[PDB]
Design a protein around this ligand. Structure first.
Ligand SMILES: [Mg+2]
Lengths: 327, 53
DNA sequence: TATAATGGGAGCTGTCACGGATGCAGG
DNA sequence: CCTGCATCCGTGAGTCGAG
């Protein structure tokens, strides 16, 4: 029925963590990563490889996919090879495997537990050019970043540290994806700053400011030309399907000509030009023909040179009918 | 154990440890197999009846 | 990169008549 | 459980011109 209501329902399935549970999960995660570093020191494999194998075993057989970071393809065959090289380690070393496993499980549980926060943060970002669910998803990415970067030692509640990353990712998304013609994030910052400034100036002046007033409130290095060019670059394109008229009848794109494809008169222009040039070249001696046509590129597409130049000056002043092709 | 070293609980002398006042009680339908030395499977592994634990 | 923050929000309301499928109470 | 009728859902609803 409604995707958002369904997601909000699936979110209300996971109960919220008590402080002890939050701390526990965070601790298990951190100690899990430490254990992965340890297993890297022991076996001599890639920390990323070991991490992805542990994760593969925790998630299930459903998810095994090649990771852009890894130096090898990760198939279940390889995850079983690596798992068998991990399990065959001595007991005190094998401990860290279990530690890492429960670490990953704790990570999954921790991410799934805090998903409501992402919703409540993304609900403030509505109508900025991104859909609700998209904001929710990018915010989820922020939440995952938070989980991986969180330190429970500081005795700060996880929502505090997570909120920052969620806002960060949501904003990054809004800046990145909300424009059909992509403008780099810093330039977007510039544009937004310009807009806020203009709104301020217009708020105090009781009227829309000029480019010069904006240049004034912008500070050093800013002039009217830069403001105008920046506002020019901030222009979003318009849809060709934009309705023209009160009815469903015609579209705005039906009034726009194609400036690319030559109209029949243009193809006829090229034809008649090549023809007239070919027929009025009767002056040409053969050597001057091949060499002067190589001069003007009429063959392969790219002293006698001077005599041919002079002869062409001679035949230009002759018929006086080629002016038309010259526009 | 704990964050800061001075918050840790160290046993004075020989004794037995009892756990009281849990924050919550978790009922999981599961079979518990106690072991002694070394375990051949890790957390998350899936096991059919007869597989060595 | 760290006070803590943990389930959205608008809705569009005065047509009309059809084929096909889907469902429920009844013989 | 097979038939029949009630109900829901999707699909249509003139042409050209001008804006
Ligand atoms: Mg200025």
């Amino acid at each position: 029925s409604d995707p958002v209501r369904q997601y909000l329902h699936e979110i209300g399935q996971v109960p919220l963590l008590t402080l002890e549970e939050e701390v526990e999960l965070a601790r298990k995660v951190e100690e899990g990563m430490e254990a992965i570093k340890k297993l890297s020191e022991i076996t001599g494999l890639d920390p990323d490889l070991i991490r992805e194998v542990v994760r593969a075993k925790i998630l299930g057989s459903a998810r095994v996919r090649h990771i852009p970071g890894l130096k090898e393809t990760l198939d279940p065959k390889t995850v079983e090879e690596i798992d068998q090289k991990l399990k065959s380690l001595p007991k005190e070393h094998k401990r860290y495997l279990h530690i890492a496993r429960e670490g990953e499980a704790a990570r999954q549980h921790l991410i799934e537990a805090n998903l409501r926060l992402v919703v409540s943060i993304a609900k403030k970002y509505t109508g900025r050019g991104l859909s609700f669910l998209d904001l929710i998803q990018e915010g989820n990415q922020g939440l995952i970043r938070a989980v991986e970067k969180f330190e429970y030692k500081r005795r700060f509640k996880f929502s505090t540290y997570a909120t920052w990353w969620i806002r960060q990712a949501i904003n990054r998304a809004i800046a990145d994806q909300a424009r059909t013609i992509r403008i780099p994030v810093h330039m977007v910052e510039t544009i937004n700053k310009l807009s806020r400034t203009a709104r301020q100036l217009q708020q105090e002046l009781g009227r829309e400011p000029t480019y010069e007033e904006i240049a004034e409130a912008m500070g050093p290095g800013w002039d009217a030309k830069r403001v105008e060019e920046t506002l020019k670059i901030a222009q979003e394109p318009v849809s060709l399907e934009t309705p023209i008229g009160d009815e469903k009848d015609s579209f705005y794109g039906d009034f726009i000509p194609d400036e690319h494809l030559p109209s029949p008169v243009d193809a006829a222009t090229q034809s008649l030009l090549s023809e007239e040039l070919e027929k009025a070249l009767s002056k040409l001696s053969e050597r001057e023909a091949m060499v002067l046509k190589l001069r003007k590129g009429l063959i392969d597409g790219r002293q006698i040179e001077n005599k041919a130049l002079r002869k062409l000056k001679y035949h230009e002043s002759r018929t006086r009918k080629l002016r038309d092709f010259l526009d | 154990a704990a964050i800061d070293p001075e918050e840790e609980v160290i046993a004075e002398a020989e004794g037995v440890v009892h756990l009281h006042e849990p924050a919550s009680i978790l009922v999981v339908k599961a079979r518990v197999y106690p072991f002694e030395d070394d375990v051949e499977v890790s957390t998350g592994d899936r096991v059919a009846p007869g597989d060595v634990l």
